[PDB]
Design a binder for this molecule. Structure first.
Ligand SMILES: CC(C)n1cc(C(=O)c2ccnc(NC(=O)Nc3ccc(F)cc3F)c2)c2c(N)ncnc21
Length: 277
């Protein structure tokens, strides 16, 4: 399950949290690897008595999922960046096994985009869309630097916190976000992650619409394999569509580097261009 991350070697140990220090509130969602709960966590940070956290409860026993749980926890503790979801540790005392993350109050970025279409309620402006995009790109620059291939970058896998802080996570094939080599040859690299970033930029600029929404799953596989490109969104300035096109070069080695994509988005976010649909 985590074999593609074998070159990543953990330094220190995973942080352990006592079960009685976690107080579950209510389910936030579930999906692939178990239920996720909002909870209060005690004695985690020396400054605060209690704080809000998101807790993932492992469903299996197993003991194949237990070995995978330990490796996953070792990898998550290695990821420390302003734009990567913050992992606090595990609770391994009894069943179920728990993973604890910093709570992000505004939830997933896909739902956030869809509810702020054409926190401060209302439509996100160009500056805000560029700030979201720049933050996701900053997280992807960090993962590329670590040689960590995400494999499922999409707005549904990003979280929004206080003050519109955006962080990348992975909550559980995502064919519509994949380049041809990933669909056809299962080749997942820093370059397939940059292609998925281009699709995330398209999601941001369409306010969370599904890529290839006009097509069935089969039609979308065929279109990606044939090389058809997603259309420029109405809210997307020409400068931003050029970034998307750079991410979508058919040849992986011709795609723009995430460092340059991030730097371009930084320049545009600190600007932004005078564009009106
Ligand atoms: C949308 C709801 C239900 N939700 C999920 C929250 C999580 O943080 C969460 C849930 C389950 N697994 C992970 N795993 C993870 O992110 N792994 C991971 C991270 C970076 C990376 F590059 C690769 C990775 F595999 C984290 C969450 C929150 N923290 N706040 C609010 N809602 C949350």
């Amino acid at each position: 399950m985590h074999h593609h991350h074998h070159h990543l070697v953990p330094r220190g140990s995973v942080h352990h949290i006592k079960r009685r220090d976690i107080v579950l509130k209510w389910e936030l969602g579930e999906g692939a690897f178990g239920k996720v709960f909002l909870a209060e966590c005690h004695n985690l940070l020396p400054e605060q008595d209690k704080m809000l956290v998101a807790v993932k409860a492992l469903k299996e026993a197993s003991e194949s999922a237990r070995q995978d749980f330990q490796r996953e926890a070792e990898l998550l503790t290695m990821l420390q960046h302003q734009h990567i979801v913050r992992f606090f540790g595990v609770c391994t005392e009894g069943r179920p096994l728990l993973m604890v993350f910093e709570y992000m109050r505004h939830g997933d970025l896909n739902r956030f985009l869809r509810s702020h279409g054409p926190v401060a309620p209302g439509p996100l402006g160009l500056g805000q869309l560029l700030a979201v995009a720049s933050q996701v790109a900053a997280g992807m620059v960090y993962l590329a630097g670590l040689h960590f291939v995400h494999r499922d970058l999409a707005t549904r896998n990003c979280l929004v916190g206080q003050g519109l802080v955006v962080k990348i996570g992975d909550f559980g094939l995502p064919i519509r976000w994949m380049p041809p080599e990933s669909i056809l040859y299962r080749k997942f690299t820093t370059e397939s992650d940059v292609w998925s970033f281009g699709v995330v930029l398209w999601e941001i600029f369409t306010y969370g619409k599904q890529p290839w929404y006009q097509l069935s799953n089969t039609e979308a596989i065929d279109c990606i394999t044939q090389g058809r490109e997603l259309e420029r969104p109405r809210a997307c300035p020409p400068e931003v569509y050029a970034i998307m096109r750079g991410c979508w070069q058919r040849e992986p080695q011709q795609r723009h580097s995430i460092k340059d994509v991030h730097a371009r988005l930084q320049a545009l976010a600190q600007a932004p261009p005078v564009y009106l649909d």
